[PDB]
């Protein structure tokens, strides 16, 4: 009871797991919204570049990159959910016998 952060390695593991889920969600989404296009304000050529033709090109590449990044984020979430399901079954077994 007196010591959790230093005495218990397992408590440090809880802190790491909580930090990892929060960091992955916060860092990934912010970076994608952070000017993915080489020269953009998160929207490509909204008014400054050659009217509709330049705007459509820059927006299209930015949208395609965002979609591929979203697919990678979704794949990571699916892997995390699968690992969680296996760990949950192990936790249920520990409660059933050891507890």
């Amino acid at each position: 009871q007196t010591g959790f952060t230093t005495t218990n390695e397992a408590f440090q593991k809880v802190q790491d797991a909580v930090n990892n889920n929060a960091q992955a969600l916060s860092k990934l989404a912010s970076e994608l919204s952070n000017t993915f296009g080489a020269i953009s304000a998160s929207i490509g050529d909204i008014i400054q570049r050659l009217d509709v033709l330049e705007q459509d090109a820059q927006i299209d590449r930015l949208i395609n990159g965002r979609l591929t990044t979203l697919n990678a984020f979704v794949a990571q979430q699916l892997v995390r959910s699968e690992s969680a399901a296996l760990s949950a079954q192990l936790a249920k077994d520990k409660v059933n016998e050891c507890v």
Binding site: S30, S33, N34, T35, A41, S42, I47, Q48, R49, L50, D51, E54
Partner: protein, 412 residues
């Protein structure tokens, strides 16, 4: 009935003639029906596009550089071109085009209407004497001699290449004796076995251009200057070609827009201070944020402030008032189809209950123009019975503990 481009889910009977159609745009349920590509979707909690707050009270923050020196006196040749930089000054594109008839107008990597409307950090204009016939030879990037050895425009910077003819009525411009350009520029090495040509950079001075007189004496004239041992020795070879002077003087103008410099507004009381709401604009950066006095972080040497993100916050732009902006507020919507009970309940995630506005009153975003205070669930829900514990329970699990059985009729 008005026609607009729309994505319609189409259901075809045995005949194949269309019998049932779904409009994805109108109603949240119709968007759900388009998803799964099924007329009826299994009951579930489904997210809908968040309702962004409407922009209001837009704030806009925006000397008199004359273009007379460029059109006054003899224009220099393309190799001897002189570039004039105009900063923090009011400018009129219409006056320049009216003054000179424009045979060719082109802008690269930018829109001519857009540059005129948008304030620019810098406006560099280059004046040169150019023959009208060789429009192709002058280019932002080309293997032609005029770009290679005379005047070039930077490809990376948005640049406008304009060819214009001075009017006879205008007397401020003085016609040059003849159009002159250096066809070939090369420097002999000290050994003299190999001679290396030099390609002029855009807005770059050339040593060969200086040795050639402003007007070349003869077409294909040859000028030789012996390079000093300090610069590696050898000789400088310049070949200059002359184009016969036209009856009407023709001038080639290169327009370069700089937005690189952070703080400069070359612009052609809603817009002013007061307005603690979503829409805003500043000297050079326009963003949507709510401004409140904060007085917390910022050297104030630069009016714009960065949040360590690719898009800077830009707060504290006014020196007099320290205002820190925030991100635009968007309210998430979650709807349970409840197909078995055929009842739809709409919940707005977070944002308390009072903050949310009925029928998107304060929010521009909606599925379509026509949409669709009791307690306070995860979010306000349009249900007649707030609590009916142990009544026909069904595990909808719309937010957390509430099972929301509608066999409407939530929080059991």
């Amino acid at each position: 009935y008005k026609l607009q481009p729309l994505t319609f889910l189409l259901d075809f009977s045995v005949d194949g003639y269309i019998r049932r159609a779904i409009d994805c745009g109108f109603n949240d349920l119709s968007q759900l029906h388009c998803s799964y590509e099924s007329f009826d979707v299994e009951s579930g909690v489904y997210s809908v596009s968040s309702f962004e707050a409407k922009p209001s009270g837009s704030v806009v923050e925006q000397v008199e550089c004359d273009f007379s020196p460029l059109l006054s006196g003899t224009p220099p040749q393309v190799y001897n071109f002189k570039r004039l930089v105009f900063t923090n000054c009011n400018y009129n594109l219409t006056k320049l085009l009216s003054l000179f008839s424009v045979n060719d107008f082109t802008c690269s990597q930018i829109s001519p209407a857009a540059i005129a409307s948008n304030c620019y950090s810098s406006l560099i204009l280059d004046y040169f004497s150019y023959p009208l016939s060789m429009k192709s030879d002058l280019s932002v990037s080309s293997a032609g001699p005029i770009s290679q050895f005379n005047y070039k425009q930077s490809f990376s910077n948005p640049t406008c290449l304009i060819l214009a003819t001075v009017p006879h009525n205008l007397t401020t411009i003085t016609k040059p004796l003849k159009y002159s350009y250096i066809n070939k520029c090369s420097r002999l090495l000290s050994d003299d076995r190999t001679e290396v040509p030099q390609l002029v950079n855009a807005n770059q001075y050339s040593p060969c251009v200086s040795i050639v007189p402003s007007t070349v004496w003869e077409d294909g004239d040859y000028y030789r200057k012996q390079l000093s041992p300090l610069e590696g020795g050898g000789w400088l070879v310049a070949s200059g070609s002359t184009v016969a002077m036209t009856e009407q003087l023709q001038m080639g103008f290169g327009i370069t827009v700089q937005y690189g410099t952070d703080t400069n507004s070359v612009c052609p009381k809603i817009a002013s201070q007061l307005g603690n709401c979503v829409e805003y604009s500043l000297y050079g950066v326009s963003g949507r944020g709510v401004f409140q006095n904060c007085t917390a972080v910022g050297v104030r040497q630069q009016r714009f402030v960065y949040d360590a993100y690719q898009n800077l916050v830009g707060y504290y732009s006014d020196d007099g008032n320290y205002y820190c902006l925030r991100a635009c507020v968007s309210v998430p919507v979650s709807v349970i189809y409840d197909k078995e009970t055929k009842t739809h309940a709409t919940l707005f995630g977070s944002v308390a209950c009072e903050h949310i506005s009925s029928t998107m009153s304060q929010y521009s975003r909606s599925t379509r123009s026509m949409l669709k205070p009791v307690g306070c669930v995860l979010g306000l829900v349009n249900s007649s019975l707030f609590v009916e514990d142990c009544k026909l329970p069904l595990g909808q699990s719309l937010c957390a503990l509430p099972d929301t059985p509608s066999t409407m009729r939530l929080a059991s």
